Every structure is written in C-alpha cells, then in structure tokens.
Amino acid sequence: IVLTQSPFQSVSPKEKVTITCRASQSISSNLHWYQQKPDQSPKLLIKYASQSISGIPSRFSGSGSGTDFTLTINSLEAEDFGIYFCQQTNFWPYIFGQGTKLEILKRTVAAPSVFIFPPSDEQLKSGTASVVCLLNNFYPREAKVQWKVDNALQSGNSESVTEQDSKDSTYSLSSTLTLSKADYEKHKVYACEVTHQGLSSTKSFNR
Amino acid sequence: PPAYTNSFTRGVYYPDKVFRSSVLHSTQDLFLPFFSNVTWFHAIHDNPVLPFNDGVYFASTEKSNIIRGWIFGTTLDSKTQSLLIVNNATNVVIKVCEFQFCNDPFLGVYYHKNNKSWMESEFRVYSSANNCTFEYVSFKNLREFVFKNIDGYFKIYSKHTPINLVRDLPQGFSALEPLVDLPIGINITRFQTLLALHAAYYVGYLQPRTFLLKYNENGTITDAVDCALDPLSETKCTLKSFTVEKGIYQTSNFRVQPTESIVRFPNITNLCPFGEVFNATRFASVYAWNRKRISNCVADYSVLYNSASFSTFKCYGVSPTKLNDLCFTNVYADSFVIRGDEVRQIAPGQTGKIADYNYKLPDDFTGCVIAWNSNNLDSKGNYNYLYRLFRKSNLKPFERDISTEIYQAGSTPCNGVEGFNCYFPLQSYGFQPTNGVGYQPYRVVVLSFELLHAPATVCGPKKSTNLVKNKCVNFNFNGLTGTGVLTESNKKFLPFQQFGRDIADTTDAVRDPQTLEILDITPCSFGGVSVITPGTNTSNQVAVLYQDVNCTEVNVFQTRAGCLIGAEHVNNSYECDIPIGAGICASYQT
Amino acid sequence: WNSNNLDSKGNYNYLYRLFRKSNLKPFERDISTEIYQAGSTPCNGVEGFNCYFPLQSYGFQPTNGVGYQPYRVVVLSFELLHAPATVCGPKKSTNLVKNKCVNFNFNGLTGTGVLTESNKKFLPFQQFGRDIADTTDAVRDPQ
Amino acid sequence: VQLVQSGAEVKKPGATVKISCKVSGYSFSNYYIHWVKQAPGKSLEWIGYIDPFNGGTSDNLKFKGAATLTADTSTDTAYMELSSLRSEDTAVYYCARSEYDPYYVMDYWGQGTTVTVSSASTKGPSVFPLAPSGGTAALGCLVKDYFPEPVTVSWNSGALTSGVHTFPAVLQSSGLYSLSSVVTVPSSSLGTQTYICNVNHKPSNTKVDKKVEP
Ligand SMILES: *[C@@H]1O[C@H](CO)[C@@H](O)[C@H](O)[C@H]1NC(C)=O
Ligand SMILES: *[C@@H]1O[C@H](CO)[C@@H](O)[C@H](O)[C@H]1NC(C)=O
Ligand SMILES: *[C@@H]1O[C@H](CO)[C@@H](O)[C@H](O)[C@H]1NC(C)=O
Ligand SMILES: *[C@@H]1O[C@H](CO)[C@@H](O)[C@H](O)[C@H]1NC(C)=O
Ligand SMILES: *[C@@H]1O[C@H](CO)[C@@H](O)[C@H](O)[C@H]1NC(C)=O
Ligand SMILES: *[C@@H]1O[C@H](CO)[C@@H](O)[C@H](O)[C@H]1NC(C)=O
Ligand SMILES: *[C@@H]1O[C@H](CO)[C@@H](O)[C@H](O)[C@H]1NC(C)=O
Ligand SMILES: *[C@@H]1O[C@H](CO)[C@@H](O)[C@H](O)[C@H]1NC(C)=O
Ligand SMILES: *[C@@H]1O[C@H](CO)[C@@H](O)[C@H](O)[C@H]1NC(C)=O
C-alpha cells in the first residue's frame, strides 16, 4: 500500500530516463505519473500507467511489471526535466512517490552575474545595514558565498539563497549580509565572494 | 472596570398579589440571593450592554435623578420589540415602540437656564420609530427595580425610598411591590440603560432561590431568609420560623456526586465478524446479498489498515476516521460482489443498473460502503455472481429482490417461460480475469450504522475507560451499571461467576473483565446534615454535623457520629446539653 | 380552517422551518436567518454541501392534496383564573349580597362562602387574602 | 477547465482553516475531486477525495485535522477544511479533479492553496532602495523582514518592465524573509526619469511606494 519513486534522475539529452515507482505488497494495474515544475502543480503525464493525455509528449512512457512501475522518458529535452510523482491505485488512498527530481545535464556553463549593492541610506537611518550580493546566470547550481570584511571572513550574518531554475535555464541567486551601521562604517572593504564550481568572483564596495 | 459590592438583603419582592398576615410563608421563585456579588456602575466626568439572564435587580441611588431610562431586548437592531422606558420630569413615560437603535442613546442636560437641564428634546436614541405594541404615559434617595420575563410578562417592582449613604447599597430591608406588568412577550437577552449627559447604579441577577418570607399584620414583608445562603438559614426553611430554638435539627442531605465514569469491556475477546463479511468465502449475489447482523462487538476496524485493502473505502454519512470514537447501534454489512463500474452506482441517491434494480441505497443512507477487487480470486470464467437486468420500477430502500418470475416486456402473458417479449430478469456477470478494470469483480460490503438515539451494541474501536480505585465513580462493567467506590477486595470468586452480591441482592463485588480482579462497591456517602445550634436568641453561629461520613468529601473534627464542622473539640467533659450522637454532646459556652 | 380556497392560487409566501438544531420551547419563535449546517466545515452563511437553508415554504396549490391544502391554525391562548379578567363571557357583573350563602366569582376567582364586611387592610396592588391553610379567606370587591 | 481556490490562509497552531476550490469548464457532479497536499520541498500528500453528489469522504489517516472535504452544488466550489492546525500543516493544498468510479486520475488541479500554520504573526516588509553606482546603471528596491511568502515588487506600476529581475526570497536567521529586485537602465537617464518600486505582500496588507535617486 506504500509506493516509492527515484529521488533524482540525472541524464543527458536524447538519452532515455527510467524512473521506478516501487509499490510494496500488492499493486494495481492502474498508475498515474505527475511531472512537477518548480513552484507549480504537478502535471499528469500518464493514465492507467498505460496512457498519456492528449498534448503530452509521446516520448513519455510508463508501465508496470510485478510490483514495479517505471516512468520511462525517451529523448529528454531541456524543457522537460521536473519533479515526478506516481499514483497508487485502488488499494485504499494513494501514496504518491516521494518525488523524483529530474535534471538534464550537458547545458553550458557560465559565470554568475554578481551585482552587490550596499546598505541603503534609508536602512542606516533605522540602524540596520544589509550588504546585498545578487547572483544571476550561472550553471550548474552550487554557490558558496564567503563575505570578505576587509580581507577577513564574516562568520556571521551570512544570508545566501539556494539556487533554483531561471527562465533562461541559468540559475539566479542572491546573498544578503546583515551588519550594524557602525560595523558597515568600521571596515574598508565588504567583498562578496561567490565560488562557482570552485571559480567564484567578488563585488565588494566601500562605504 | 466594574467594581463589586455586597448585595445585602435587597431584592425581595411580593411574588404575587396575595395578602397574608403574621404568617411565615415559604416561597420558591426567582430572587436576588442575599450577600451575592453585585456589579456597580457610574455616571461621572458607562452604559454597556449587560446580560439579561433570568432577570435583573436594578437599583440607582440618586440625588438629581439622572438615571432615567432602560432599553431591553435581544437584538437592538429593531428586529424585535425593545421595551423602552423614559421617566420625564416625574412623568412616567413607557413604550415598547420598535426603532432602529443608535449605539449610544442618552438624555441631554444643559446647565442653568429657564428650562432646567433642557434637552428634554435631546432624545437621539435611534433614527425613528415604527411599531408600538404598547404605549403608556404618566445620597438622599434610592430607586430599586426588578425586571424579569415570564409568561410573556415583563414585571416591574419598585421601591422609591430615601436613604442616607453616599457610597453603596444601604444595608436594610424593604420589599418590592409590582408597579406594572406589560405582557409584550418579546424576549430580552441584553439591555442598555439610558442616561442624562451633562449617578451610581447596580445590577444583580435573579436566581431561583427559596425564601422564607414574613408578612406582617399589615401584610408587608419585614423579613426574608434565603434557604441556600448558609447552614443556619437552611434550618429556618424547615421550621418555618425566624427563631430557631436550641437543639439539633436535621435539614438536608448530601449525596457525593461521582467523579466521571468507568466503562469496561474485556480486551481482545469481544471481536466482531468483520472478516466473515469482508473475507467471506463466496459473497452472496448483488441481487440477493448477505445482510449479516453486526452487533455486541468492539469495532475491529483498526485491524483493517494492513491488508490487500480496498478498491474504495467510502463513508457516506459520517467521517471514516471518527469511527475510532464512534460507537454504533445497528450495523448490517451488505456483502456482495459486482462488476467494476458499479461500485459507482453504490451510494445514496444513485441511479443505475445496480442502484435501481438489484440493490438500493436509501437517499438518507448513513454508513461506510467498502469495495475491493476479487479479480485475484473470484475471477478464473465465473458466471456465479449474477445481477438483475429488469424490474418493473426502482427498488425501495435496501430492497432484496430475489423474484425469479420471468420479466415480461409485453402485455401478452408469458406464463413464466422465455421467448419473444419474455426475458429472464436476472442476468449473470461472466468474470474473466482479463476483463476490463470496469468489468473486474469488486467485492462490496456496505456497513449501515444508525449513529445516535439508541443504546450501543457495537462498541467503539476504543470505547474504553481506564479503572480508578477508592474514588467515587459512575461505573459500567460489561453492561452492568452502578455508581460506587471501587476498591481492591479479598473476596474470591469462582471462575465462571460474574457479580458478587449481598443479602439485599444489591450488587456488592464485581470482577474486572480486562484483567480479572475482585472489586468491592460501596454507596457514595450520604448521612443527613444536622445543624447544631444554640438558640438563635443566643447566637447566629451554628456547627454543622455531617452524619456517618469520613471527613474528606466535605475547623473540622471527626466524631463517632460523623463529620462535625464549626465546633471546637474539648477534652473536658460536662453535662450533655444538645444531644448529638454516641455520647457527643454540644453546648454553646466558651 | 382551510386556506386552500383563498391562500392557494401555488402560494410560496407561507413558509416553514425544515431544520432546527433543537426542538422549540413553548411560544419560542426562531426568526434567525442562519443556514442549517450539517457539516463540520463552516457554511459561512452560504449554502453548499451539508448546508441547507432551514426555512422552506410549501407551494400551496388548490390542486395539492388535502395533506398539502394549507390550513390556517389560530391557537387561542388564555390564562384561566387567579388573574384579573379582561376577556369575559356574556356575563355582566351582578349585584353583591352580604351575610347570605352565595356562590360567587370575583375576577375569575370562584368559590362558595358567606361574604361580609371585614376590616383587614390590603396593600393596594393586592387581590386575594389567604389563611394559613392556603384557602381563599378574604377577597376585595374589584369594582 | 478551471479550479478556482480560496486565497492563502495563514493560521496559528490549534486554529482551523477552510479552503475552497471552485469547478468550472467541466461537469461538476460527474467528477469527484481529489485533494493533495504538498509540504514545502516535500512530496504530494493526499488528504482526501470528495464527491459532489455525496457529502462523504475517504481520509488518509496520517495527520488528523478532522479534515472534511465539502463541495458545493451551486457554486461548484469545493471546500477543504483542516482543523486542529499544527505547524507541520504549513503546505500547499492542491484540489484535484477525479472520476465517478474506481478510475482515479487528476489531470487538472487548481494552482494549489498555500497555507501557513505558525505561532508567529504576519509582519509587513521594510522596503529599502539600492542606489545605482556598458552605459547602464542597476538600481533596485531591497525588501527585508517580511512574512509570509510571496511578495511581488513591480516598477513604475508596470511602466518599467524590461530590466526587472525578481530574485528568490530567503528566510534569514530571525525567522523573516528577504528579497531583492533590480532593474538595469541606461546611465544617461539617471535623474531625468523617476524610478519607482511598488511592493505587494498579500497577507500583511502592505502597499509601500519608494523613489530611487542617485
Ligand atoms: C463574588 O465575586 C468573585 C470575584 O470577585 C467571584 O469569584 C464569586 O463567584 C462572586 N460571588 C458569587 C456568588 O458568584
Ligand atoms: C413627557 O412625555 C410625554 C410623551 O411621552 C410628553 O407629552 C410630555 O410633554 C413630556 N413632559 C412632561 C412634563 O409631561
Ligand atoms: C400598619 O400601618 C399602620 C399605618 O396606618 C401603622 O399604624 C401600623 O403600625 C402598621 N401595622 C403593622 C403591623 O406594621
Ligand atoms: C482478511 O484476510 C487478510 C489476509 O488474507 C487480512 O489481512 C485482513 O485483515 C482480513 N480482513 C478481515 C476483516 O478479517
Ligand atoms: C488485557 O490486555 C492485557 C495486556 O494488554 C492482557 O494481559 C490481559 O489478559 C487482557 N485481558 C483480557 C481479559 O484479555
Ligand atoms: C429572646 O430574645 C428576645 C428578643 O428577641 C429577648 O427579649 C429575650 O430576653 C430573649 N430571651 C432569652 C431567654 O434569651
Ligand atoms: C477515614 O479515612 C481514613 C483514611 O482515609 C481512615 O484511616 C479512617 O479510618 C476513616 N474513618 C472512617 C470513619 O471511615
Ligand atoms: C486533648 O489532649 C490531647 C493530648 O492528650 C491532644 O492531642 C488534643 O489536641 C486535645 N484536644 C483538644 C480539643 O485540645
Ligand atoms: C366602576 O364603575 C362604576 C360605575 O357604575 C363606579 O361606580 C365604580 O366606582 C367604578 N370603580 C372603579 C374602581 O373604577
């Protein structure tokens, strides 16, 4: 009555990805697959495990054997990769797959676009200072923001967003560093390092 | 913030129009209890809604007589009648006139001109008036009213009396006669007084006390004694006297009320035939299906979670999860196998081949319908599960139709044989394992449970109280009900036995089913209350004797005769004066 | 009596309460417009599943059966005795006679006795006198 | 075709939340409605499927909120109430269309109902500018200290669109949210054209305007 799915599914374009839906004890003829793009309702790709609704790519396929169901997509495309779910059918209500995050590699690599902006003249008026480091257009998604206070690391007030898909199939990101108004005027250089694939940049500004 | 004060004796009135003289007449009516806590108010430098309750004791001390108005009712939007009362320059003016209320009605007061206070046109309580189902026209001082709705009668009692006190309700007793009696009938849950805006006033809440009243020779109440007030006053209510002479008096009785309750059924032993329905070897057909009485059973529905489980689990009436808390009365599992698409047709108010013809749920149906695949067993094909294709009409609620009389489309009599315009009404489902998912056989069980209004046979999946000792509880053991003090006990049953008993046949000892142990029983406590008093001529102090109890459930002292309260034990021994019991004798002196 | 021949035309303006969360107390009118909520989810005042407007009106057609033929039920409600009489039968107040055995009625209070002049002194609002035994001992001539 | 849902309800632990999903474009009574919850960064969690014709429901046991799915015949608006709320119940609530038999698909949902059960009250954002330093100048309004999500910042009320890039939010160490929005505009236009951000936080009812100058 419990079914699990592949956490992540990393593959390359045109290659065929197969994502198992493994349902314990007895399984049912019917199953249904859900493609989820980030911050969106999952989308039903498959019916009875055997059928896709119209307009859904025929490259999408699903099936089952024994207790195992598999989401098999042939020739992945850069718009396709998304979070996958599979329905349980009959046998009391349906436990969806834990989700399967599909990534498609082979996309080109580029450096993050860093724009740092200092604490505004309005912030310092109320006593808060936020040094804002803004990251755009880097692939794949990892970054480690090391704030350089002068040449010294700031081991506190380090806020860096997690990386997510952008509309360009790049990754947009942001790093916020909170400091006191005095601390912002007590050091020469506030430098945002963003290390991407081991190759990070810098965008520190002087007060 | 509302400040309290002490009601004293105020709020006694003439409960009806009867006259009496030099008689002490008990009466039981809605009163303002003595020494109750009474809210207190102002007009200074404040007229909120108050709960009407069962009535009000209103009073307003006055010098300049500023508190002139009352607005009563449920709504204050005019949807009802709101009684209105306006006292204008000594002229009583009364209305039930309906109008749309403003938040803050009041009276205006302007200082020092030819019309004193002016603003006797002030009078914005509202927009305008529509219906009037009645009309009428006409610190130094204290004004006292009582407002209560009964029999569509809003009664008004009043005393206009002068006083000398600035601070609070004067301590003294005079009783209220009925001023008017408008039987509008409109209910009142809330009210707002009406003030003059440039005045202390009180609100008590009537309560169903029993009083002992003294009508003097002129037929006026000079005295009243609240029964429930305290030990000494309970006595006077029994004796019909205001002077209780020396000696002990039995007044009331106290029955220790139980703590909560104990319901006890043996664990794991009482199990319902749920598998003999769900897992039954061969379900009866959908046209004639098994109605298996489900009763006298702790609900086993919690075991149902781990299994091949169900094509669907559907509870039409009530939540499927609350079943854990939900104990049943009549449960009848409706057990049959059907084709796949027709679990659909099983629901209150469905129209289909199953629902109309071979099986019918009422439109009011309440219960949990349960269907699952037999494709793994009942399929091999399998023609044995059969259905009703034809009927003269739709089925009645839970109609089991076995009728094999050949269905007939035409008027020409078929005489009970097949042919043209002659059809066998009962058609069979062939079950082939490769049939469509909607042709797959589904095993259906329909639990019909009636919910409330009846005693419970099917016991809730839990429906179990834990067990408590030495503390008065209201217990049920395996259907045996009783209220007592459950204790450990050394008396030893024979194994097959259930109840111990006593010479009176009254239940005495019991055996805890879930774990066999021999529990005694015992009544609550009882004993009579006894008020030991010196003559009311000597003191108003009394010592209460609770008879034949242990001092818990109540300056306390334990006696042979019971729990005594309010009399200091004395190791010295004197002549018996007020006899109590077992040699204990009380006297007043130091 | 039947309103079928007049009120029925049918007539939706005569309405009834199909649901109430309890049973009414005597002469208790429920004018609340609150929807009847049969579910746990709030109806929020609006209808839905397990939300029914409890106040329903039978359409009364003269073609409706005797069971559905609207009847106008007027319930007369009177308080019997012990109270001052307002509605009175075709009985005009008789003369009063003293020191002679007479059946009597005063203000609806009835009994049989010997009516005399008496010096016991009522309070104005009062009606009866009474004795220790809850008999009616002394009455005041209302007129 | 459409499933229209009630807005985002943010509640306290032990509170209650009822949530609507309206049916249009297809036949309401012919289709059951699944209800599937998605917790933050988590999988699809199925609370119940409902019937339009019948008021009964099948309930995944799991979290017990006394959940009662209630649809509507006239408005086709399917309520889902979750009572006895707990901070776990913070999640997205997806109403999902279903069939009127064993067959169970959901090919169309609403947008999902974001709901937050939290002991922290909704707080308004504090908006602050970011001053502009290839012939372009990047300026922006920095929104800090808000809750809950989301926040939509525009520029010149839709008159400034090209160049506006909205950066994802972060929940910082104080239990509050931070976002940044920057537009890239030429360096000749500085001072001769006013740049204005309009910040929208729906639960906290905060509309704040600001002017970005050198
Ligand atoms: C008297 O007031 C106190 C609060 O000040 C309240 O606890 C008590 O119940 C009041 N008396 C009565 C008889 O309710
Ligand atoms: C009192 O009220 C009545 C109307 O209720 C009004 O006719 C009268 O003039 C008022 N004042 C006096 C002094 O009677
Ligand atoms: C009754 O009232 C009269 C006043 O006329 C008074 O003289 C008399 O003392 C009163 N009697 C009693 C018993 O109070
Ligand atoms: C029916 O039998 C299965 C095992 O074959 C078991 O899991 C299930 O609980 C049983 N159901 C009942 C109601 O006894
Ligand atoms: C009740 O349960 C306990 C353990 O849970 C068991 O030892 C005891 O025998 C049970 N009682 C009966 C009557 O089965
Ligand atoms: C009893 O009380 C009355 C006053 O009510 C008093 O005059 C009398 O002396 C008292 N007698 C005794 C024996 O206490
Ligand atoms: C009262 O209870 C105590 C213990 O609770 C016991 O020692 C004593 O004997 C009891 N007395 C009576 C009269 O029940
Ligand atoms: C009587 O004397 C005993 C000691 O023998 C003492 O414990 C008890 O408190 C005394 N009684 C009173 C009423 O003082
Ligand atoms: C009642 O009316 C009569 C007129 O015949 C009159 O004599 C009598 O005094 C009146 N009594 C009252 C109380 O109005």
Author numbering:
A (entry chain D): 2 to 208
B (entry chain B): 25 to 69, 80 to 172, 186 to 245, 263 to 444, 447 to 620, 641 to 676
C (entry chain A): 436 to 444, 447 to 580
D (entry chain E): 2 to 134, 140 to 220
From the paper:
The S1 subunit binds the host cell receptor, while the S2 subunit mediates fusion of the viral membrane with the host cell membrane. Hinge-like movements of the RBD give rise to two distinct conformational states referred to as the “close” and “open”, where close corresponds to the receptor-inaccessible state and open corresponds to the receptor-accessible state, which is supposed to be metastable. We reported a potent therapeutic antibody H014, which can cross-neutralize SARS-CoV-2 and SARS-CoV infections by blocking attachment of the virus to the host cell.
Cryo-EM characterization of the stabilized SARS-CoV-2 S ectodomain in complex with the H014 Fab fragment revealed that the complex adopts three distinct conformational states, corresponding to one RBD open + two RBDs closed (state 1), two RBDs open + one RBD closed (state 2) and all three open RBDs (state 3). Ambiguously, the special conformational transition observed in our complex structures results from the engagement of H014 or a synergistic movement of the SD1 and RBD. Superimposition of the structure of the H014-SARS-CoV-2 trimeric S complex over the ACE2-SARS-CoV-2 RBD complex structure revealed clashes between the ACE2 and H014, arising out of an overlap of the regions belonging to the binding sites located at the apical helix (η4) of the RBD. Thus, the ability of H014 to prevent SARS-CoV-2 from attaching to host cells can be attributed to steric clashes with ACE2.
